[PDB]
C-alpha cells in the first residue's frame, strides 16, 4: 500500500518555475513534518539551482494533514498566501518551514502565522488571522486532502517527478537522476 504512480494534477496549486518546464516535481508535504523541514533546507535548494532556475523543472506543493490541528492551521494560511499574494508565496513557505521547532509539542498558532505573513508578504496579519478563524480557505485544504487520498499518500514528504514516485526524498542522487531521465524522455 504505497503512493500511486501517475501524474498528480497541479491545477490550482502553488507553482514555482517556468510555465513551459518539461518536468513537474510535486511535493506532498506538511508544515509540521520534520522530514519536510529537512527537504526544505537540504534538498529543495539543489532542485532550485540545478533545474528550476534553468527552466527544466516546475515545482508544486500540496498540503497533507498528518499532524493534527496545527497542520490544518498552517495549510489554511498557506492557501491564503497563494491566493492573495502568490509572488510572495515561496518566501512565506520557506520561512514557515524554517520556523518549525525541533520539539514535539504544538507550535502553530494564528499569531505565529500572522508574523510570517507580515515579514514575507503584502498580506495584513489581522486579515490572515481573521481568515484562519473563519476557515475561509477550507475548500482548498479539502481539495488537497482529496488529491492526497487519490494518490494514496502514506508519509510526508512524498515527491513526484512527473509520474514517478521518489522512494527517498532525502536521496538527491535518486531525485537528480530521475529528473534527468524524465528530461531525456521529453
Nearer to Ca ion, 13 or 24 (CB): 13
x-or-dash string of contact with Ca ion, 88-127, rule CB under 5 A: ----------------------------------------
- List the one residue from 76, 144, 151, 158 that touches Ca ion (CB under 5 A): 144
- Provide the total of helices (H) and of strands (E) in the chain, helices listed first: 8, 5
Residue least distant from Ca ion (Cβ): 144
Q: Which CB, 78 or 178, lies closer to Ca ion?
A: 78
Among positions 70-89, residues that touch Ca ion (CB under 5 A) are none
Q: Which range in 16-24, 29-37, 98-106, 139-147 contacts Ca ion by CB under 5 A?
A: 139-147
Cis peptide before 135 (omega within 30 of 0): no
Selected range binding Ca ion among 5-13, 15-23, 49-57, 154-162, rule: CB under 5 A = 5-13
- Nearer CB in complex with Ca ion: 60/178: 60
- C-beta pairs of 51-55 under 8 Å, 24+ apart in sequence: 51/23, 51/25, 51/179, 52/16, 52/17, 52/21, 55/17, 55/18, 55/20, 55/21
56 vs 144, beta carbon nearer Ca ion:
144
Residue 147 CA: distances (Å) to CA of 7, 12, 79, 88, 114: 11, 12, 15, 24, 27
Cβ closer to Ca ion: 13 or 158?
A: 13
Stretch that binds Ca ion, among 97-105, 113-121, 142-150, 164-172 (CB under 5 A): 142-150
Distance CA(90)–CA(27), nearest Å, equals 13
Q: Is 173 exposed, middle or buried (0-12, 13-18, 19+ CB in 10 A)?
A: exposed
Q: By rule CB under 5 A, what count of residues binds Ca ion?
A: 2
Task: Show the beta-strand stretches assigned E in 30-179.
Answer: 57-63, 158-161, 164-165
Summarize as ranges the residues that interact with Ca ion (CB under 5 A).
13, 144
Amino acid at each position: 500500500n504505497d503512493a500511486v504512480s501517475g501524474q498528480p494534477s497541479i491545477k490550482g496549486q502553488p507553482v514555482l518555475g517556468k510555465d513551459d518546464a518539461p518536468v513537474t516535481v510535486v511535493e506532498f508535504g506538511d508544515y509540521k513534518c520534520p522530514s519536510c523541514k529537512v527537504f526544505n533546507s537540504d534538498i529543495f535548494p539543489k532542485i532550485q539551482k540545478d533545474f528550476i532556475d534553468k527552466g527544466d523543472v516546475k515545482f508544486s506543493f500540496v498540503n497533507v494533514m498528518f499532524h493534527g490541528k496545527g497542520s490544518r492551521l498552517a495549510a489554511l494560511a498557506s492557501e491564503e498566501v497563494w491566493k492573495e499574494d502568490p509572488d510572495s508565496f515561496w518566501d512565506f513557505h520557506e520561512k514557515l518551514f524554517e520556523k518549525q521547532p525541533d520539539t514535539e509539542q504544538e507550535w502553530v498558532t494564528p499569531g505565529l502565522l500572522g508574523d510570517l505573513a507580515k515579514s514575507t508578504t503584502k498580506i495584513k496579519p489581522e486579515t490572515l488571522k481573521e481568515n484562519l478563524d473563519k476557515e475561509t480557505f477550507a475548500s482548498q485544504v479539502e481539495k488537497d486532502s482529496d488529491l492526497n487520498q487519490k494518490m494514496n499518500i502514506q508519509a510526508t514528504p512524498t515527491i513526484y517527478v512527473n509520474d514517478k514516485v521518489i522512494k527517498n526524498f532525502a536521496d538527491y542522487d535518486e531525485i537528480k537522476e530521475t529528473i534527468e531521465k524524465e528530461l531525456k524522455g521529453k
